[PDB]
Design a protein around this ligand. Structure first.
Ligand SMILES: C[C@H](NC(=O)[C@H](C)NC(=O)[C@H](Cc1cc(-c2ccc(-c3cccc(Cl)c3)cc2)no1)CP(=O)(O)c1ccc(Br)cc1)C(N)=O
Ligand SMILES: [Ca+2]
Ligand SMILES: [Ca+2]
Ligand SMILES: [Ca+2]
Ligand SMILES: [Zn+2]
Ligand SMILES: [Zn+2]
Length: 159
């Protein structure tokens, strides 16, 4: 078992906002992404406007202070650190992507669901239906659902 959060009550804060999207749409996408995971675990997520949060959400480009530089438009879209103090848990989104609420560019919600999975301690799945599959694909946001494998995975960590 890799690292897990030692509590079910987990805080997050959005450090900064991509200019690609309306600020309220970023808030909404991130909120719903956390909700996807809270819906299948005992985890509860609380948004922090100011102060110390377990999970910091950052938009940045290229080399941005963590020895894992982003790569311009395309390729890697985002990355996240597993549960832990400091940078542990934090989710970073490559500002060189074009973030959207829809099928165009890269959908922030779907990407955030995947990254938050990492923030909670999940690794990848080989199931092409799993949100934790390694490569992004757009899927109909309304019909979006975690796969049985995603659920097995996260319930193995928290219950
Ligand atoms: C352009 C696009 N790029 C990608 O997908 C790239 C490769 N992947 C990455 O950018 C990953 C980040 C990433 C993956 C996803 C994703 C995956 C699957 C689905 C999905 C799939 C099927 C069904 C359903 Cl319902 C959903 C949705 C989103 N969203 O973000 C990077 P990472 O966080 O894994 C990472 C970074 C650094 C290290 Br070190 C380790 C891990 C592509 N090639 O398709
Ligand atoms: Ca990139
Ligand atoms: Ca952190
Ligand atoms: Ca951008
Ligand atoms: Zn980073
Ligand atoms: Zn991943």
């Amino acid at each position: 078992m890799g690292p897990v959060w030692r509590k079910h009550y987990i805080t997050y804060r959005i450090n900064n906002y991509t200019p690609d999207m309306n600020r309220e749409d970023v808030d909404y996408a991130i909120r719903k992404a956390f909700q996807v995971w809270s819906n299948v675990t005992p985890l509860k997520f609380s948004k922090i406007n100011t102060g110390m949060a377990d999970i910091l959400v950052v938009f940045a480009r290229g080399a941005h202070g963590d020895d894992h530089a982003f790569d311009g438009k395309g390729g890697i879209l985002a990355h996240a650190f597993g549960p832990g103090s400091g940078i542990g848990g934090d989710a970073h989104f490559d500002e060189d992507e074009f973030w959207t609420t829809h099928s165009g560019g890269t959908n922030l919600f779907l990407t955030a669901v995947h990254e938050i999975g990492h923030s909670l301690g999940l690794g990848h799945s080989s199931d092409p239906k799993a949100v934790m599959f390694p490569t992004y694909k757009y899927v109909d946001i309304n019909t979006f659902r975690l796969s049985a494998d995603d659920i097995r995975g996260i319930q193995s960590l928290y219950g």
